[PDB]
Symmetry: C2
Subunit: 323 residues, 2 copies
């Protein structure tokens, strides 16, 4: 039925072609202290963000899920301005990053007060059923993240909170996996606490190339995402070549009703402008919102995937996920 | 001669009685993502902050150094408003927190671009010689922090940057030590890179009770601080009893020209409001800006310390430090 976007509630029928994981705004926790050399280009950032939405709208996309966590400069009103100008639908999130690239100390401190997991739940409920700050916007998904090879104590507080929240709300859960680890464990641990696998998207699965690992995850009946198309050389991540050679294994075996695709782009960066060093800067030349529809998809056809199947992924699956 | 406060440059002669370490505003990194339940009480916070300044002004304090790091919600314009209303002098900082209660990922990421330590220097120079963001305020001190028993790789980038900045500027360095560790190592590592010990305040020394350790540190000719008076029972911290019994050892042995005192208070908290749990909330009942002048000081007299000596600590030392 209905899904909360930044422009208030929307019928899931009208979601349409959907990218599951892209950032308009993103900054690594700590960017706020580099304000002096990295002040936020308020009205140019908006100009770039609308550039990316119009760039997405023209390949038939009607909906983006933006899972930018609360500590990476999530900005729902900004996003609201973008949708108001483009008509694109934008679903935002409620969540923190993970230990390795998040902001532990604050909730670490409350953990000592004994109230952290309640506070995270209370925050999740608030942002899902009341609205984010005074923006009036509710998050449409819960963002979760785990570390490499571990779901830390701190992360588990959020997983628990997240599972208990979803039971109270029916919110979709979207997750981050670190370097192709902890897919199954994530699914397992959320299902243990009463989350519903049909309302769960294990993310960054494209970060493992052994399809055995994906199947172990799909077996929970959760959705999985290859949401990092375009990112190469970094994090130890595999090439777009590996992804497709890993993606195709799961398509012929008819799992497409559990797979969705994205790029995990950052269209505007918070903090100090930077430019990638020259080894790095050519491997990730393809990391942009165009990448899938002009490259990844044609490649998929040449290896024989029905356009019907893809529609399950970009339209059916997301419509399914949110209902 | 001159020191940069939030109200522009000021003659060091007019610093006067000085608290070396107190926060008006503070939040643990991550507080920004708890915005919905923890929105910043803009104009009440200002009302509380002026309460604390007026409360400090009446025990003769004319100057506070507020070392709130860039990632813990440092707010120089806010501070500026406080001084403009009270006439108090407020010197702010340029720094990041340490790894355990800091926000590593952002500078961690730049470390991979190969430019982090330059960027930290460039940030330090900017905030010391040009101004913080568009506030026009320059930091008067550099804030540095290390972990328990370790000065991590990440922290050393900032120490190096900090030492090279001070050489270019003459800025005072103020530091944080974790649980009474790394005093000497900090001094040693800064002196190695050309920092001047007479422009350095090793902080949280009151976190070690073995005076042997302090002397090892004082031997570098750096200043040291017992800046956590009132914080008891927490972090592994020692009682105000231990501090004084540790402080007195260094006074009779005539080091007072290297010691200064504070409380390290947080007069307004960013993030979700909270009550300290029932055990904790008793031990730290004394953690407030009044604590020193009404309690710690009388206690010091009864054990026979000349008011002249104290003046070296609250007036002479700081005046010395900044010139
Ligand atoms: Fe992402
Ligand atoms: Fe402090
Ligand atoms: Mn991610
Ligand atoms: Mn500190």
């Amino acid at each position: 039925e209905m899904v909360e976007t930044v422009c208030g509630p929307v019928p899931v029928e009208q979601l349409g072609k959907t990218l599951i994981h892209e950032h308009f705004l993103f900054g690594y926790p700590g960017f706020q202290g580099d304000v002096t050399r990295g002040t936020f280009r308020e009205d140019e950032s908006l100009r770039v963000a609308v550039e990316a939405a119009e760039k997405m709208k023209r390949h038939g996309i009607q909906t983006v899920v933006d899972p930018t966590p609360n500590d990476c400069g999530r900005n729902p009103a900004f996003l609201r301005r973008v949708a108001e100008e483009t008509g694109l639908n934008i679903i935002c999130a409620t969540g923190y990053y993970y230990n390795g690239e998040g902001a532990p100390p604050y909730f670490q401190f409350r953990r000592l007060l004994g109230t952290a997991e309640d506070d995270i739940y209370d925050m999740f409920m608030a942002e899902l059923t009341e609205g984010i700050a005074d923006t009036g916007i509710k998050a449409g998904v819960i963002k979760l993240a785990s570390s490499k090879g571990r779901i830390t104590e701190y992360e588990k507080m959020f997983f628990r909170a997240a599972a208990r929240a979803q039971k109270e709300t029916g919110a979709v859960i979207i997750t981050h996996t670190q370097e192709g680890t902890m897919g199954p464990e994530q699914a397992a641990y959320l299902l243990e606490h009463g989350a519903d696998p049909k309302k769960i998207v294990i993310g960054h699965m494209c970060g493992n190339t052994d399809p055995d690992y994906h199947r172990k995850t799909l077996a929970y009946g959760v959705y999985i995402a290859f949401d990092r198309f375009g990112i190469q050389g970094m994090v130890g991540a595999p090439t777009d070549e590996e992804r497709v050679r890993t993606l195709l294994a799961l398509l012929r075996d008819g799992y497409e009703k559990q797979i969705m695709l994205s790029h995990d782009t950052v269209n505007v960066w918070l903090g100090r402008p930077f430019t990638l060093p020259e080894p790095f800067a050519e491997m990730m030349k393809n990391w942009h919102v165009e990448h899938l529809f002009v490259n990844i998809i044609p490649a998929l056809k040449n290896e024989g995937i029905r356009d019907e199947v893809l529609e399950q992924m970009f339209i059916g699956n997301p419509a399914a996920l949110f209902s």
